[PDB]
Amino acid sequence: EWSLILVNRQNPIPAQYDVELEQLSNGERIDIRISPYLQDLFDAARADGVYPIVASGYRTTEKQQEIMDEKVAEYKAKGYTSAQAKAAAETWVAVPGTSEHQLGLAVDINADGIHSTGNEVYRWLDENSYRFGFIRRYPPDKTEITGVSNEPWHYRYVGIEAATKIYHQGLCLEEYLNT
């Protein structure tokens, strides 16, 4: 049940949540408990000609604050007021303390580019990640529940058992944890 912890705008991360982190090959940090499942996920893809990379894993509070601030600045640079920019940014970037990147269980996956395209890696993960305990966290048809826009790059570890049941039923994490 530890891998089924929900962190949303409706469910802030507890400040008691300390994560045992290990450093990936690219310097990014993840929870040590998802490490072999993540390694298996990438070995699987590379066997099918898909070459994925971890663009973002664990993030400190200030790190999320930096990402939010730059996103806000983008909207302000395009005629949005402070309030409008922040409101528009919160739909893409999570408020510092509501991001599951602070859990260390979430990874932003991109293509390496030189072997696979962005489309190829995202579609392979869409139909294979569940077998290794990872789910496409923010579906385009579940944006009203997750409160987050379409992010085909964001994947969250929930465990093989949960991910399989989530994928087969076509639900998101919020719906799955709903009785």
Active-site hit among 151, 161, 174, 175: 151
- Taking the least distance from each CB to Zn ion, the nearer of 86 and 101 is 101
Residues belonging to the chain: 179
154 is annotated as contributing to ligand binding: yes
15 is annotated as contributing to ligand binding: no
Closest distance of CB 69 from Zn ion, Å: 17
Closest distance of CB 109 from Zn ion, Å: 9
Site for Zn ion, residues 20 to 79, rule: CB under 5 A: none
93 is annotated as contributing to ligand binding: yes
Quick one: which segment of 7-15, 27-35, 107-115, 124-132 binds Zn ion (CB under 5 A)?
A: 107-115
Closest distance of CB 34 from Zn ion, Å: 14
Tell me the Ramachandran region of residue 99: left when phi exceeds 0, alpha when psi lies from -120 to 50, beta otherwise.
beta
**SS (HEC) of the chain:** CHHHCCCCCCCCCCCCCCCCEEECCCCCEEECCCHHHHHHHHHHHHHCCCCEEEEECCCCHHHHHHHHHHHHHHHHCCCCCHHHHHHHHCCCCCCCCCCHHHCCCEEEEEECCCCCCHHHHHHHHHCCHHHHCEEECCCCCCHHHHCCCCCCCEEEECCHHHHHHHHHHCCCHHHHCCC
Quick one: which segment of 5-13, 69-77, 101-109, 122-130 binds Zn ion (CB under 5 A)?
A: 101-109
Q: Would you call 66 a catalytic residue per the annotation? A: no
- Taking the least distance from each CB to Zn ion, the nearer of 105 and 162 is 105
Size of the site for Zn ion (CB under 5 A): 2
Contact between 154 and Zn ion by CB under 5 A: the answer reads yes
- Within 8 A by CB and 6+ apart from 12, the residues are 97, 98
Quick one: which segment of 3-11, 78-86, 153-161, 171-179 binds Zn ion (CB under 5 A)?
A: 153-161
Catalytic residues: 151
Q: Residue numbers of the site for Zn ion (CB under 5 A)?
A: 108, 154
